Write a protein that holds these residues in place. Structure first.
Motif, PDB file in Angstrom:
ATOM      1  N   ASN B  17       0.812  -1.226   0.094  1.00  0.00           N
ATOM      2  CA  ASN B  17       0.067  -0.050  -0.044  1.00  0.00           C
ATOM      3  C   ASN B  17       0.895   1.028   0.010  1.00  0.00           C
ATOM      4  O   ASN B  17       0.510   2.240  -0.691  1.00  0.00           O
ATOM      5  N   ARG B  18       2.014   1.065   0.783  1.00  0.00           N
ATOM      6  CA  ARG B  18       2.952   2.532   0.776  1.00  0.00           C
ATOM      7  C   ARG B  18       3.551   2.546  -0.588  1.00  0.00           C
ATOM      8  O   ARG B  18       3.605   3.626  -1.068  1.00  0.00           O
ATOM      9  N   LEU B  19       3.884   1.467  -1.383  1.00  0.00           N
ATOM     10  CA  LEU B  19       4.255   1.516  -2.897  1.00  0.00           C
ATOM     11  C   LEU B  19       3.242   2.312  -3.834  1.00  0.00           C
ATOM     12  O   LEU B  19       3.545   3.199  -4.566  1.00  0.00           O
ATOM     13  N   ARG B  20       1.861   1.985  -3.514  1.00  0.00           N
ATOM     14  CA  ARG B  20       0.534   2.311  -4.180  1.00  0.00           C
ATOM     15  C   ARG B  20       0.696   3.948  -3.940  1.00  0.00           C
ATOM     16  O   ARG B  20       0.512   4.711  -4.972  1.00  0.00           O
ATOM     17  N   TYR B  85      -5.755  -3.260  -0.950  1.00  0.00           N
ATOM     18  CA  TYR B  85      -4.311  -2.936  -0.240  1.00  0.00           C
ATOM     19  C   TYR B  85      -4.456  -2.893   1.220  1.00  0.00           C
ATOM     20  O   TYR B  85      -3.449  -2.477   1.634  1.00  0.00           O
ATOM     21  N   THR B  86      -5.356  -2.908   1.810  1.00  0.00           N
ATOM     22  CA  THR B  86      -5.534  -2.639   3.457  1.00  0.00           C
ATOM     23  C   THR B  86      -6.056  -3.713   4.241  1.00  0.00           C
ATOM     24  O   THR B  86      -5.938  -3.585   5.451  1.00  0.00           O
ATOM     25  N   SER B  87      -7.143  -4.395   3.707  1.00  0.00           N
ATOM     26  CA  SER B  87      -8.140  -5.440   4.347  1.00  0.00           C
ATOM     27  C   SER B  87      -9.196  -4.794   4.958  1.00  0.00           C
ATOM     28  O   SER B  87     -10.024  -5.295   5.752  1.00  0.00           O
ATOM     29  N   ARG B  88      -9.329  -3.311   4.908  1.00  0.00           N
ATOM     30  CA  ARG B  88     -10.278  -2.315   5.420  1.00  0.00           C
ATOM     31  C   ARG B  88     -11.294  -2.098   4.552  1.00  0.00           C
ATOM     32  O   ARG B  88     -11.002  -1.531   3.404  1.00  0.00           O
TER      33      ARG B  88
END
Ligand SMILES: CSc1ncc(Cl)c(Nc2ccc3c(c2)CC(=O)N3)n1
Ligand SMILES: CSc1ncc(Cl)c(Nc2ccc3c(c2)CC(=O)N3)n1
Ligand SMILES: [Cl-]
Ligand SMILES: [Cl-]
Ligand SMILES: [Cl-]
Ligand SMILES: [Cl-]
Lengths: 4, 123, 123, 4
Positions: B17-20, B85-88
């Protein structure tokens, strides 16, 4: 760390 | 006889997610009614039956742009891309119908299941 | 106000490993003393401080082949590449020194920590 | 699914  | 690091999968997803967020090594643009979303093909495939089918196709695997069906709502897609990207999942009364329809099209079975359950509770 | 799917990160990693096993969308070869390992740059970056630094470099980000230091043991790398895609570490008396040295070079802090602990218990 |  665990024993899976 | 392996040992397992409990937080490894979550830490991997957090870094992806940081890369995204920094647009690092993104290799595809998903177009949704003129709105554009940059992402990693491998993450999209890992989360969606539809993207899995698309990027395993010998011709589509090489495309840098994928256009979704015009009925797909950009906000519903955005919420689902965030979930990937977060499971949220940002599931709300005002978006649940668009999120469920988008998850059905993307083939994200667990999201479809929780949407069906949340709708059934309100009826 | 998000809801969270507990198994999502693990399911993502499982699918990424399925892609690796079928050589789908792998975009780099890691060369270790003539042994070759195919992988996904994003997964390598998500797991390793060394690969993170390499693939964020404006020149190295575009390389399809990365050669590791000749002191790196191919079995130690293989065990760590398996850990990256599964959260499972095959740590054994006969490989712990090579795994720790490889994890230190790759900058995989949690692996280095468990190797230090397992070595300390045997002394 | 849980409340994180
Ligand atoms: C089936 S083998 C496999 N191997 C690798 C990948 Cl990247 C993959 N993804 C995928 C396929 C189908 C579905 C999902 C992901 C989420 C969902 O609900 N359905 N599948
Ligand atoms: C630091 S921000 C960040 N953002 C994105 C990525 Cl892909 C990344 N990976 C990475 C960096 C350092 C280390 C690891 C992964 C594992 C470890 O032990 N150290 N880091
Ligand atoms: Cl294209
Ligand atoms: Cl899902
Ligand atoms: Cl090259
Ligand atoms: Cl680690």
């Amino acid at each position: 760390w665990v024993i899976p | 006889s392996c040992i397992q690091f409990t937080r490894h999968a979550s830490d991997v997803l957090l870094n992806l997610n940081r890369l995204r967020s920094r647009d690092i090594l993104t290799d595809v643009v998903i177009v949704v009614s003129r709105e554009q979303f940059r992402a990693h093909k491998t993450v999209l495939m890992a989360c969606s039956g539809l993207f899995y089918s698309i990027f395993t196709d010998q011709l589509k695997c090489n495309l840098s742009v994928i256009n979704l069906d015009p009925e797909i709502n950009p906000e519903g897609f955005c919420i689902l891309l965030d979930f990937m990207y977060t499971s949220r999942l940002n599931l709300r009364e005002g978006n649940i119908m668009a999120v469920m329809a988008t998850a059905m099209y993307l083939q994200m079975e667990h999201v479809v299941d929780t949407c069906r359950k949340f709708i059934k509770a309100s009826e």
